[PDB]
A paper describes a structure:
pmcIsocitrate dehydrogenases (IDHs) catalyze the NADP+- or NAD+-dependent oxidative decarboxylation of D-isocitrate to 2-oxoglutarate (2OG, α-ketoglutarate) and CO2, and NADPH or NADH. The most common mutations in metabolic enzymes in cancer are somatic mutations in the IDH1/2 genes which are found in >80% of low-grade glioma and ∼20 to ∼30% of acute myeloid leukemia (AML) patients. These active site variants still catalyze the conversion of isocitrate to 2OG, albeit at a reduced rate, but have a substantially enhanced ability to reduce 2OG to the oncometabolite (R)-2-hydroxyglutarate (2HG), a reaction only catalyzed very poorly by WT IDH1/2. Interestingly, all the potent IDH1/2 variant inhibitors active in vivo bind allosterically at the IDH dimer interface; their selectivity for IDH variant inhibition arises (at least in part) due to disruption of Mg(II) binding which has a larger effect on binding of 2OG than the isocitrate:Mg(II) complex WT substrate.
Structures with R132H IDH1, R172K IDH2, or R140Q IDH2 were not obtained, however, 3-butyl-2OG was crystallized in complex with R132C/S280F IDH1 in the presence of catalytically inactive Ca(II), substituting for Mg(II), and NADPH under reported conditions. R132C/S280F IDH1 has been observed in AML patients treated with the R132C IDH1 inhibitors enasidenib or ivosidenib and manifests resistance because it restores IDH1 variant–catalyzed 2HG production. Note, it was not possible to define the absolute configuration at C3 in 4 complexed with R132C/S280F IDH1, due to the resolution of the structure (2.35 Å; note, we refined and deposited the structure with 50% occupancy of each (3R)-butyl-2OG [(3R)-4] and (3S)-butyl-2OG [(3S)-4]; Polder omit maps of the data refined with solely one enantiomer are shown in Fig. S7). Furthermore, NMR and mass spectrometry studies confirmed IDH1/2 variant-catalyzed production of alcohols in the cases of the 3-methyl–, 3-butyl–, and 3-benzyl–substituted 2OG derivatives; a crystal structure of 3-butyl-2OG with an IDH1 variant (R132C/S280F IDH1) reveals active site binding.
Residue numbers in the entry:
A (entry chain A): 3 to 416
B (entry chain B): 3 to 315, 322 to 415
The structure:
Amino acid sequence: KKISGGSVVEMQGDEMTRIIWELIKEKLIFPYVELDLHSYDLGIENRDATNDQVTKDAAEAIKKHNVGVKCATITPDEKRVEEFKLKQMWKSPNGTIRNILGGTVFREAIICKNIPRLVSGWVKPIIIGCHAYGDQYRATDFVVPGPGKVEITYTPSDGTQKVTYLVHNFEEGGGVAMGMYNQDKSIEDFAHSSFQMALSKGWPLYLSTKNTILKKYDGRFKDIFQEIYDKQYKSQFEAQKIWYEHRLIDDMVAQAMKSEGGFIWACKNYDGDVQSDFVAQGYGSLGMMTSVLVCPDGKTVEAEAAHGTVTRHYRMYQKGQETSTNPIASIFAWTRGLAHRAKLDNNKELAFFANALEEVSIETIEAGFMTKDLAACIKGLPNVQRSDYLNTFEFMDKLGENLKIKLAQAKLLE
Amino acid sequence: KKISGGSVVEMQGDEMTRIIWELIKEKLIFPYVELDLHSYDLGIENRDATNDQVTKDAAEAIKKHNVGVKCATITPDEKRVEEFKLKQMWKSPNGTIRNILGGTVFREAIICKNIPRLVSGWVKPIIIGCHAYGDQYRATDFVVPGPGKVEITYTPSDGTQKVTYLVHNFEEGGGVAMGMYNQDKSIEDFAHSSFQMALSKGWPLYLSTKNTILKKYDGRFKDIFQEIYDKQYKSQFEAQKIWYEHRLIDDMVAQAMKSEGGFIWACKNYDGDVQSDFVAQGYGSLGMMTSVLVCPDGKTVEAEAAHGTVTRHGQETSTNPIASIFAWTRGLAHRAKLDNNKELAFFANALEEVSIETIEAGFMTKDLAACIKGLPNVQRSDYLNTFEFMDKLGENLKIKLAQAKLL
Ligand SMILES: NC(=O)C1=CN([C@@H]2O[C@H](COP(=O)(O)OP(=O)(O)OC[C@H]3O[C@@H](n4cnc5c(N)ncnc54)[C@H](OP(=O)(O)O)[C@@H]3O)[C@@H](O)[C@H]2O)C=CC1
Ligand SMILES: NC(=O)C1=CN([C@@H]2O[C@H](COP(=O)(O)OP(=O)(O)OC[C@H]3O[C@@H](n4cnc5c(N)ncnc54)[C@H](OP(=O)(O)O)[C@@H]3O)[C@@H](O)[C@H]2O)C=CC1
Ligand SMILES: CCCC[C@H](CC(=O)O)C(=O)C(=O)O
Ligand SMILES: CCCC[C@H](CC(=O)O)C(=O)C(=O)O
Ligand SMILES: [Ca+2]
Ligand SMILES: [Ca+2]
């Protein structure tokens, strides 16, 4: 029979990533794994039909079943509202999910030996732990229409006092203003997730803030990270001959730029978004990256495809024209999610399947079979001929062909 | 007879970059240029002694004389306060001077033909325009001691809209919160500075925000840039076959990493700080970069060393002085442009050529030697110490100026 997968929360996406999402299930997953799939359509039209409530419901389902796999989704702008006749410009589904689940988003490049790096020195991988809560991505911003006073206040729950901070006094014209926050318990979980990842990988840990300018806001990050390290992880880091050190964000980017990789980089929410694409593009391809949210409870995770929905290929697919879409990021979202499922269920067979699918993906590309984007990384786009790459279905066919071989060879071992 | 330099405002710095600052004046500037130098000791000890008033006075002198050159300074924190026994944890001198002067900080790599780039495709130079006003670098942040409400409010001086927004309701434990702002007029001057720089260099311009998430805050940047572009600059951009487009910040870093350079990168205040080190390190060395604040009045300029006061610190040292030198040359070059001073303009350009020619001839400091061969495979024979490299530059500056005098 097939492998007893377990309960997995699925989040369907938009445009070309939704087409690839179904190809992965039909060709690579379902033929070998039986899943209790709790499907939530996070497509832009079902989010619009439910007033974005399906997004919140999918997050609660991940809390209940501990495993979620997410397809890439559209964050609508002004043009998207016109295109789909949306009722509202719905907020980012990833922001809503991360705000509900909390935790740390760990991102790392998907390395193939034949994909050229842009940073030649990065001979070892760089893992970024993105704090998935607060800051710019859960803030209150507004337009200041004219002269006036913008203030930010804090009132303790006991109501015994009240502190009013002056943000700015607009004396001529208007502008913008915003307020953002972060939570002590969220920063402490963010620290523990960062220290444990450095111990499981054997690499040093670096936290990047700007506490020289944000003395109180970022100073909380530096103090919490430093307090937890000295009390619970100091001797453990010294045992594995590693370390933890705080860095200014501007110095950290340049430090990582000229390093040789091999370290954990704990980033605040906004820096994690910016610099993970900096790392992904530096290793070769922006789309060759994993993105797994690790919740503070230590049992719930959300694996996702972090790139876009590839609109240009979706337009070609609807006109029946040939496309060449890279599915690796969407594939590794399934494997990373199924791997954690097998860890929680002690499923030896599901764990072997997830790792085997990741091997087949890497081995197929390293054998010379790849989509057009990966061929352009090697030969350069103006030098890419049609015989240099495979289309969307040819590449999925090659993966399923090689996955079927590797899984069959493993059966002949009893 | 030396060159009549004119009135220049000087800002002295901290630690090693202060030592280099005096060596540049002693060995490169003073022997050839006579200056009405307005000196302001922005050292951490004198800032503490004057309760940071010397920083505000220096910023105001820049308004009056239109040209200032700044040495790298210490921004104190907890470890620095205990070190110098400071009264307060003084704010950044650059944050104060920029908040007073306003304008755009343009940063660009100092290119030497024999320095290897970490990003191979970058064959054309990238120029970052940093909005020097507002955002996290002029914000109000604080620690939330416990449960309670954090609200942000806008009270109009003449209007009917006393609006209150809930920032967050802390229900368990405490945390942190902050409020920040920006100004329409400052964003507009930031827009014009970006469009005009792209037309003077003949390159396309890109603006990076995160307006998909910060719809109102960052949407204002994108709307103001697009409105000024369509009304006052789109025809000129099409004439030179260049363009302006808005990008998301995370998409923009990956696009720039994958590009071949040759564009202007309009950056918000925080991104301008982070990404300018990303660009400088990608072109080779973090300390080979110019940083000039251009004020919106089109005549006031502040040149600085973009890096720090030598983080990594009677022995010999070998420390790169190029960025500090170009702070002087860019300042004197603008001092000469304002004064129509041809001799001063020639001296400023000659010193920059001497600096690049010396490095391209094999004479360089230890960091640049480690750039070409790697630090572990670097010996004393591969570099010059601090005093020898400065003497080598002065030896070549005396030669270049003597050659031009006999022509
Ligand atoms: N985290 C998330 O869920 C994110 C979602 N998005 C959403 O994605 C949508 C489109 O974003 P956009 O900026 O246009 O980026 P796209 O994903 O559309 O990518 C732009 C171009 O890159 C190439 N490309 C990207 N991904 C692949 C792939 N897997 N295989 C092959 N080629 C690829 C294609 O180039 P070519 O045409 O030359 O073949 C494509 O036209 C938006 O609605 C946005 O909100 C965006 C970013 C993150
Ligand atoms: N005045 C200003 O504008 C600035 C002031 N500062 C202040 O400086 C201090 C430290 O700053 P910080 O951001 O930590 O670090 P720095 O900006 O001083 O530089 C960090 C690293 O970059 C490399 N580097 C920088 N400048 C040079 C150079 N000229 N030649 C060769 N290599 C160079 C060195 O790398 P490696 O270790 O590999 O040799 C150095 O360790 C603080 O007090 C801070 O407030 C910081 C930034 C700007
Ligand atoms: C929640 C804000 C950050 C998420 C954003 C995609 C999105 O618009 O949801 C992004 O660039 C990323 O996935 O890193
Ligand atoms: C508020 C401006 C902060 C600038 C900072 C240096 C500092 O003052 O600490 C920095 O590294 C730079 O951008 O040059
Ligand atoms: Ca991103
Ligand atoms: Ca900096």
